[PDB]
Amino acid sequence: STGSATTTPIDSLDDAYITPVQIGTPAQTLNLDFDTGSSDLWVFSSETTASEVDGQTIYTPSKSTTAKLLSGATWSISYGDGSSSSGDVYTDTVSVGGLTVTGQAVESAKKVSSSFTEDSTIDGLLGLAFSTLNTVSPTQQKTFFDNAKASLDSPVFTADLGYHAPGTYNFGFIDTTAYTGSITYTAVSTKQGFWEWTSTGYAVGSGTFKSTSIDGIADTGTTLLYLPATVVSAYWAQVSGAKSSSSVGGYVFPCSATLPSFTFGVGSARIVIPGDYIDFGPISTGSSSCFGGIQSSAGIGINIFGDVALKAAFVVFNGATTPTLGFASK
């Protein structure tokens, strides 16, 4: 089997991408944030505290003839940005782009943190990291991909995120028309439950490539590119007037600037992030100070190749017995 679904930016900045997902019978379509940095499929629901729902579409398990309460199971998650959610668990039929999993754990939120409530465009998350990170207790549950894998034509999914435009998540096949050149594959460590890999270095604009190992995660659920402070300083030093602002929370730059590109290495291959992809717009409405798309990871504990990096590439998440990642230009 295969599946293919379009993923759409939630706003004009590409702050996140939403993909329609069919849950239950008859289908209830919710727009979920596909997140290769986490491993829970959780949704706003008829069980979510009413004051914490503000425009999201909800899953109502009582209206699904295939929903079954997973007795005794609860979940609770906290994300790297400080947001969180928790609740109980159903199993139900879940379909993405024509690919159907029966008995998928659907984690129904009883509580969500304010950042989720305040984002009416995201109805929940669909985790695509390794199932070892799934938070369901006392019996950990499998991700949608883990449940589908054996049925897929090939045990892979691909992320093809658009810049200021829709893109595609495919399951079970590699669309050879969706990229240019070849796909360069690179080793993955699953020891932390992430799609963790090592970039071979970077360049700023037309500058020379610096060969240096940068361990990080491929994370579709993180907006920005978070890299070591040395790398980030080298980038922003090429933007007149850019500076790190403690009060804003990162590097800012004059909105009048033209940003240089940023290149990262994948083995001997190179992925070029155009400068425009690094512009996240005014820090507040009407400001002439703009927020940068490359930020320091120093306070995180891990480097994160988020959407800023991934949308410059066609990315293969190869879930073979020994997982690997592939990157192609497009």
Cα dihedral angle (35, 41, 43, 49), rounded to 10 degrees?
Answer: -110
Using alpha carbons, select from 90, 181, 201 the residue that is nearest to residue 141: 90
Query: For every residue of the chain, which 3-state class applies, written as one string?
Result: CCEEEEEEECCCCCCCEEEEEEECCCCEEEEEEEECCCCCEEECECCCCHHHCCCCCCECHHHCCCCEEEEEEEEEEECCCCCEEEEEEEEEEEEECCEEEEEEEEEEEEEECHHHHCCCCCCEEEECCCHHHCCCECCCCCCHHHHHHHHCCCCEEEEECCCCCCEEEEECCCCCCCCCCCCEEEECECCCCCCEEEEEEEEECCCCCEEEEEEEEECCCCCCEEECHHHHHHHHCCCCCCEEECCCCEEEEECCCCCCCEEEEECCEEEEECHHHHEEEECCCCCCEEEECEEECCCCCCEEECHHHHCCCEEEEECCCCCEEEEECC
Q: Do the Cβ atoms of 32 and 43 come closer than 8 Å?
A: yes
> What is the spatial distance between Cα 293 and Cα 278, in angstroms, rounded to a whole number?
4
Degrees to nearest 5, angle at CA 128 with 28 and 213: 155
Degrees to nearest 5, angle at CA 267 with 14 and 234: 60
For the chain, the first-to-last Cα distance in angstroms comes to 25
Q: Which member of 199, 261, 296, 297 is catalytic?
A: 199
Q: How was this structure determined?
A: X-ray
Token pair, residue 194, equals 């992430």
Token pair, residue 192, equals 């932390």
> What is the spatial distance between Cα 140 and Cα 131, in angstroms, rounded to a whole number?
8
- β-bridge partners, 266: 269
Give me the amino acid identity at 256: S
Using alpha carbons, select from 166, 147, 167 the residue that is nearest to residue 158: 167
Verify whether residue 175 is a known catalytic residue: no
Domains annotated on the chain, with CATH: 5-174 (2.40.70.10), 175-330 (2.40.70.10)
Give me the amino acid identity at 315: V
Contacts of residue 136, defined as CB under 8 A and 6 or more positions apart, other chains included, come to 40, 70, 73, 74, 75, 89, 105, 107
Which element (helix H / strand E) includes 307?
helix 307-310
Token pair, residue 63, equals 């209206």
CB burial class (10 A; 0-12, 13-18, 19+) of residue 209?
middle
Q: Do the Cβ atoms of 35 and 128 come closer than 8 Å?
A: yes
How far out from the chain centre does Cα 311 lie? 10
Q: Do the Cβ atoms of 19 and 6 come closer than 8 Å?
A: yes
Q: How many CB atoms lie within 10 A of CB 303?
A: 22
Verify whether residue 153 is a known catalytic residue: no
Q: Do the Cβ atoms of 148 and 1 come closer than 8 Å?
A: yes
> What is the spatial distance between Cα 232 and Cα 210, in angstroms, rounded to a whole number?
13
**Pair type for strands 294-296 and 225-227:** parallel
Using alpha carbons, select from 178, 161, 176 the residue that is nearest to residue 6: 161
Give me the amino acid identity at 147: N
Q: Do the Cβ atoms of 91 and 59 come closer than 8 Å?
A: no
Token pair, residue 188, equals 């993955």
> What is the spatial distance between Cα 149 and Cα 172, in angstroms, rounded to a whole number?
8
φ, ψ dihedrals at 137, nearest 5°: -130, 145
**What is residue 71's three-state secondary structure?**
strand
